[PDB]
Design a protein around this motif. Structure first.
Motif, mmCIF file in Angstrom:
data_model
loop_
_atom_site.group_PDB
_atom_site.id
_atom_site.type_symbol
_atom_site.label_atom_id
_atom_site.label_comp_id
_atom_site.label_asym_id
_atom_site.label_seq_id
_atom_site.Cartn_x
_atom_site.Cartn_y
_atom_site.Cartn_z
ATOM 1 N N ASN A 16 1.029 -0.995 0.173
ATOM 2 C CA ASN A 16 -0.123 0.382 -0.215
ATOM 3 C C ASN A 16 0.595 1.225 0.421
ATOM 4 N N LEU A 17 2.359 1.304 -1.338
ATOM 5 C CA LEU A 17 2.403 2.475 -1.037
ATOM 6 C C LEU A 17 1.998 3.516 -1.670
ATOM 7 N N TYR A 18 1.316 3.163 -2.778
ATOM 8 C CA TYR A 18 0.510 4.123 -3.643
ATOM 9 C C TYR A 18 -0.839 4.259 -3.325
ATOM 10 N N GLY A 19 -1.003 3.922 -1.953
ATOM 11 C CA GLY A 19 -2.588 4.404 -1.267
ATOM 12 C C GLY A 19 -3.812 4.362 -1.657
ATOM 13 N N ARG A 20 -3.589 2.735 -2.290
ATOM 14 C CA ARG A 20 -4.695 2.390 -3.086
ATOM 15 C C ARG A 20 -5.584 1.557 -2.754
ATOM 16 N N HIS A 21 -5.109 0.888 -1.604
ATOM 17 C CA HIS A 21 -5.742 0.397 -0.484
ATOM 18 C C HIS A 21 -6.185 1.491 0.895
ATOM 19 N N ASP A 22 -6.631 1.133 1.862
ATOM 20 C CA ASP A 22 -6.951 1.636 2.822
ATOM 21 C C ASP A 22 -5.451 1.753 4.017
ATOM 22 N N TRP A 23 -5.545 2.581 4.486
ATOM 23 C CA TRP A 23 -4.467 3.585 5.225
ATOM 24 C C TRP A 23 -4.489 3.405 6.825
ATOM 25 N N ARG A 24 -5.802 3.107 7.097
ATOM 26 C CA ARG A 24 -6.614 3.474 8.393
ATOM 27 C C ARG A 24 -5.961 1.702 9.386
ATOM 28 N N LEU A 25 -6.185 1.654 10.286
ATOM 29 C CA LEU A 25 -5.721 0.104 11.213
ATOM 30 C C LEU A 25 -6.662 -0.528 11.248
ATOM 31 N N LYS A 26 -8.001 -0.450 10.772
ATOM 32 C CA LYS A 26 -8.664 -2.578 9.301
ATOM 33 C C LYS A 26 -7.937 -2.407 8.066
ATOM 34 N N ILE A 102 5.788 6.661 2.600
ATOM 35 C CA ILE A 102 5.477 5.585 3.718
ATOM 36 C C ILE A 102 4.968 6.763 5.317
ATOM 37 N N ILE A 103 4.762 7.545 5.534
ATOM 38 C CA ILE A 103 4.212 8.501 6.278
ATOM 39 C C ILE A 103 2.264 7.988 6.312
ATOM 40 N N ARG A 104 1.547 9.085 4.853
ATOM 41 C CA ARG A 104 1.008 9.172 4.909
ATOM 42 C C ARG A 104 -0.128 7.712 4.201
ATOM 43 N N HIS A 105 0.528 6.882 3.595
ATOM 44 C CA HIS A 105 -0.186 6.165 2.983
ATOM 45 C C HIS A 105 0.519 4.176 3.965
ATOM 46 N N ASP A 106 0.790 4.555 5.128
ATOM 47 C CA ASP A 106 1.693 2.919 6.086
ATOM 48 C C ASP A 106 1.501 4.166 7.118
ATOM 49 N N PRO A 107 0.632 4.784 7.743
ATOM 50 C CA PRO A 107 1.686 5.373 9.248
ATOM 51 C C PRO A 107 1.712 4.432 10.661
ATOM 52 N N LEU B 198 3.618 -3.360 -7.316
ATOM 53 C CA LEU B 198 2.171 -3.162 -6.526
ATOM 54 C C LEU B 198 0.851 -3.985 -7.672
ATOM 55 N N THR B 199 0.679 -4.401 -8.610
ATOM 56 C CA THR B 199 -0.023 -5.298 -8.771
ATOM 57 C C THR B 199 -0.763 -6.170 -8.096
ATOM 58 N N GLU B 200 0.116 -7.219 -6.961
ATOM 59 C CA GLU B 200 -0.385 -8.198 -7.061
ATOM 60 C C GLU B 200 -1.161 -7.675 -5.437
ATOM 61 N N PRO B 201 -2.139 -8.664 -4.989
ATOM 62 C CA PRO B 201 -3.361 -8.597 -3.703
ATOM 63 C C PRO B 201 -2.160 -8.987 -2.925
ATOM 64 N N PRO B 202 -2.558 -7.952 -2.078
ATOM 65 C CA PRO B 202 -1.779 -8.129 -0.334
ATOM 66 C C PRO B 202 -1.518 -9.311 0.157
ATOM 67 N N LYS B 203 -0.911 -10.459 0.299
ATOM 68 C CA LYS B 203 -0.480 -10.977 1.127
ATOM 69 C C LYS B 203 -1.518 -11.597 2.333
ATOM 70 N N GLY B 204 -1.602 -10.736 3.870
ATOM 71 C CA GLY B 204 -2.062 -11.417 4.382
ATOM 72 C C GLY B 204 -1.237 -11.225 6.016
#
Ligand SMILES: NC(=O)C1=CN([C@@H]2O[C@H](COP(=O)(O)OP(=O)(O)OC[C@H]3O[C@@H](n4cnc5c(N)ncnc54)[C@H](O)[C@@H]3O)[C@@H](O)[C@H]2O)C=CC1
Ligand SMILES: Cc1cc2nc3c(=O)[nH]c(=O)nc-3n(C[C@H](O)[C@H](O)[C@H](O)COP(=O)(O)O)c2cc1C
Ligand code: SF4
Ligand code: FES
Lengths: 430, 213, 63
Positions: A16-26, A102-107, B198-204
């Motif tokens: 999640n470096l590019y921020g396409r996924h959630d950056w919060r705790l869950k 790193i800070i903005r997307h993976d805190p 970073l095209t792959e979905p995350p592993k978990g």
């Protein structure tokens, strides 16, 4: 193994470096963050120090000091004063923007790294010195810190391990010299951001006179992954004393400027051709590459063909790795104008405490402005070289070396260009 | 750019300034964030908080900050003069900063600069007559892969062309708030020619955890 | 308005390596003398870390 590069997506730490996924705790908890942290906290500081010194991880701030030893001088019994870990989140260096992402997307990765590091040295709390201009990143980090505080990961009985740890965010006020660790320590204490003199090292006397370890964001956020996956997994990449993964910010005159993680010993030509999409006008349009931002000297096209982007293959190439920030200049650029702009940046960001930088950086700025205008003689050029030799190694902090290196590199690689410029000025106006 | 102060009716030590009670609570939290015996560290955030009261620093917030933290006022003057983000002169409501360092100079930030100068009718370091804009030139702001870029107030407007910065200025004049992001197709830092990595979905969780942990 | 004088020994400064040589030259020529002891400065205990103490008053206000 001899061929490096082409890192698989499975082995990349910074998901999640590019921020396409959630950056919060869950969102971070479903990617691998905050998993079995209490086991590491129970195994403790000796195991954490051994696992981070087995990987061969060096300092990603730009000096390349080994992280295991640097976190190992602080491990000592208490003398009545608390212990502190401080995270350098300034990145005033031009070309470098990796820790911003790193800070903005993976805190939460940064917070878990702070917790693991503070367990390694027995630190009482963590101080994050974010940049003053990075208001949104600071607010994102504060939101993530509150989310981790609510779930019991940090604070009172951190992660169910009986250890006490805190995290604080201290905003800057727009200073590049505050990126230096001793100047950062002074600026935390409410003073002017002027660096101290080592000795005393921060491991003995640091912030508020307490033992202190100042570490970069990139070398902190990868510590839980090192302690979880294993030291040998991190050491399986790159050469010897060149282990791990590195974030590269490729920018300048490139088709697609981007931030991308890669193997630690990737070739420069392969990285530019693959990730950046190629130089503007093709590979044959290259003129110069700065490998690690304004501190590191530039290298021409003749060296960039067969070079490796790690510490050893770049110190052997009369330059440095630095922060691994690629600045690309093609044939349609004035190199002297770019170096003059870099020296102007270095004179606009200089704390002015110690004499050689305070006078010589302004002297170099005036000489470089005359070089750009061409109103100079060739006999001055080597004199300018000697000016750099009167700055490097005679200053308190390494901004003097970081200002003397680009002038030396530009002179050593393009003396004929400067000579042609000044002789054209002489034959035209006189 | 004068680092000495001359007493004026606009900027005098008797200029009225006082924090709001909610700002007093925030200042108390800032002070409680620091170890006891080292209250002077709270000089750094609280003075910045005073800027958020006014948008600029007269010499009455510095004396007030020195008074509430038991530090001499000369230390507060040193802090306010060392850093460049503290405004000691009354700036406009929308403070525009244009980065012209080398990774931004290679991507033609001076084009953005002359477009702003032509649109607003002002120069670098000059305030608009209606006190709506103030254009200066700053060093690198840490988004060099999004070059060229500007910062307005606390928001980043990156990867601009002259047309986008003209549209941003017309949107600021209308009273609306533009989205603080790059104006190109990409979102944060991805290459414009598609996601190379970073095209792959995350592993978990549970992946790669070594034994004995 | 010049500084007129009548003292022949007004500009007489004599240099000696040690105190005993000076005192022997003094009593050789029959001059009454006053001897002042040499004031060597007391050595200090300098410490750069003392400017960044944790619980002491030697913290520098600024630098
Ligand atoms: N990341 C960025 O934004 C920037 C990075 N840099 C790079 O950073 C470097 C300059 O930074 P420095 O901290 O001056 O480098 P280096 O001389 O100081 O030392 C790196 C770290 O090792 C520690 N250390 C070294 N010897 C030690 C000892 N004997 N005992 C205990 N600790 C010891 C220092 O305290 C420091 O934390 C250069 O390589 C430059 O290119 C420069 C400008 C900006
Ligand atoms: C002028 C100057 C500015 C620096 N700025 C930064 C910075 O912004 N971020 C950073 O991590 N290191 C910066 N450093 C390097 C630090 O001195 C030090 O290497 C860093 O705080 C921790 O490095 P480490 O990763 O080896 O632990 C700077 C150094 C100098 C001389
Ligand atoms: S080299 Fe320059 S910035 Fe560093 S301590 Fe000396 S005067 Fe300050
Ligand atoms: S060079 Fe402009 S943001 Fe860094």
């Amino acid at each position: 193994k001899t061929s490096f590069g082409s890192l698989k997506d499975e082995d990349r730490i910074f998901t999640n470096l590019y921020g396409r996924h959630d950056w919060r705790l869950k969102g971070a908890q479903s990617r691998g963050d905050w998993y079995k942290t209490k086991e590491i906290l129970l195994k403790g500081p000796d195991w954490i120090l051994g696992e981070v010194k087995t990987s061969g991880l060096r300092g990603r701030g730009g000096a390349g000091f080994p992280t295991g030893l640097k976190w190992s001088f602080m491990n000592k019994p208490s003398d009545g004063r608390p212990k502190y870990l401080v995270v350098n989140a300034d990145e005033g260096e031009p070309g470098t923007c990796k820790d911003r992402e790193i800070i903005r997307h993976d805190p939460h990765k940064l917070v878990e790294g702070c917790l693991v590091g503070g367990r390694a040295m027995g630190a009482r709390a963590a101080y994050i010195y974010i940049r003053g201009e990075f208001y949104n990143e600071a607010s994102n980090l504060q939101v993530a810190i509150r989310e981790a505080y609510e779930a019991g990961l940090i604070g009172k009985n951190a992660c169910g391990s009986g250890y006490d740890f805190d995290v604080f965010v201290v905003r800057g006020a727009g200073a590049y010299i505050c990126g230096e660790e001793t100047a950062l320590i002074e600026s935390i204490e409410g003073k002017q951001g002027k660096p101290r003199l080592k000795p005393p090292f921060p491991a003995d006397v640091g912030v508020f006179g307490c033992p202190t370890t100042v570490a970069n964001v990139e070398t902190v956020a990868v510590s839980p992954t090192i302690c979880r996956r294993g030291g040998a997994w991190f050491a399986s990449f790159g050469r010897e004393r060149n282990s791990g993964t590195k974030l590269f910010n490729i920018s300048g005159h490139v088709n697609n400027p981007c931030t991308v993680e890669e193997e630690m010993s990737v070739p420069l030509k392969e990285l530019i051709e693959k990730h950046a999409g190629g130089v503007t006008g093709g590979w044959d349009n290259l003129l110069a590459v700065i490998p690690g931002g304004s501190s590191t000297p530039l290298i021409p096209k003749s060296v960039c063909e067969t070079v490796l982007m790690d510490f050893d293959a770049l110190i052997q190439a009369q330059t440095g790795l630095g922060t691994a920030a690629v600045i690309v200049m093609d044939r349609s650029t004035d190199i002297v104008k770019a170096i003059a702009r870099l020296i102007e940046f270095y004179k606009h960001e200089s704390c002015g405490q110690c004499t050689p930088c305070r006078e010589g950086v302004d002297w170099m700025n005036k000489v470089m402005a005359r070089f750009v205008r061409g109103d100079a003689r060739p006999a001055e050029i080597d004199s300018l070289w000697e000016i750099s030799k009167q700055i490097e190694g005679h200053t308190i902090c390494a901004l003097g070396d970081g200002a003397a290196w680009p002038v030396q590199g530009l002179i050593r690689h393009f003396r004929p260009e400067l000579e042609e410029r000044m002789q054209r000025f002489a034959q035209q106006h006189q | 750019a004068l680092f000495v102060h001359r007493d004026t009716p606009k900027n005098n030590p008797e200029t009225p300034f006082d924090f709001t009670p909610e700002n007093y609570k925030r200042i108390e939290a800032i002070v409680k964030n620091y170890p006891e015996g080292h209250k002077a560290a709270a000089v750094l955030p609280v003075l910045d908080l005073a800027q958020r009261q006014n948008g600029w620093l007269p010499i009455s917030a510095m004396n007030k900050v020195a008074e509430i933290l038991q530090v001499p006022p000369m230390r507060v003057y040193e802090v306010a003069t060392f850093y460049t983000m503290y405004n000691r002169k009354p700036v406009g409501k929308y403070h525009i900063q244009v980065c012209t360092t080398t990774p931004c100079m290679l991507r033609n930030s001076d084009s953005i600069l002359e477009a702003i100068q032509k649109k607003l009718g002002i120069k670098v370091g000059e305030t608009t007559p209606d006190k709506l804009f103030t254009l200066i030139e700053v060093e690198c702001l840490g988004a060099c892969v999004n070059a060229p870029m500007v910062q307005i107030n606390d928001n980043y407007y990156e990867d601009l062309t002259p047309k986008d910065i003209e549209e941003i200025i017309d949107e600021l004049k209308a009273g609306k708030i533009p989205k603080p992001g790059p104006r190109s197709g990409r979102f944060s830092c991805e290459p414009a020619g598609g996601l190379t990595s970073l095209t792959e979905p995350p592993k978990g969780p549970g992946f790669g955890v070594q034994a004995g942990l | 308005g010049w500084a007129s004088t009548a003292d022949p020994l007004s500009n007489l400064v004599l240099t000696f390596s040690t105190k005993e040589d000076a005192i022997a030259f003094a009593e050789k020529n029959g001059w009454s003398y006053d001897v002042e002891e040499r004031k060597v400065p007391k050595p200090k205990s300098k410490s750069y870390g003392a400017n960044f103490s944790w619980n002491k008053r030697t913290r520098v206000s600024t630098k």
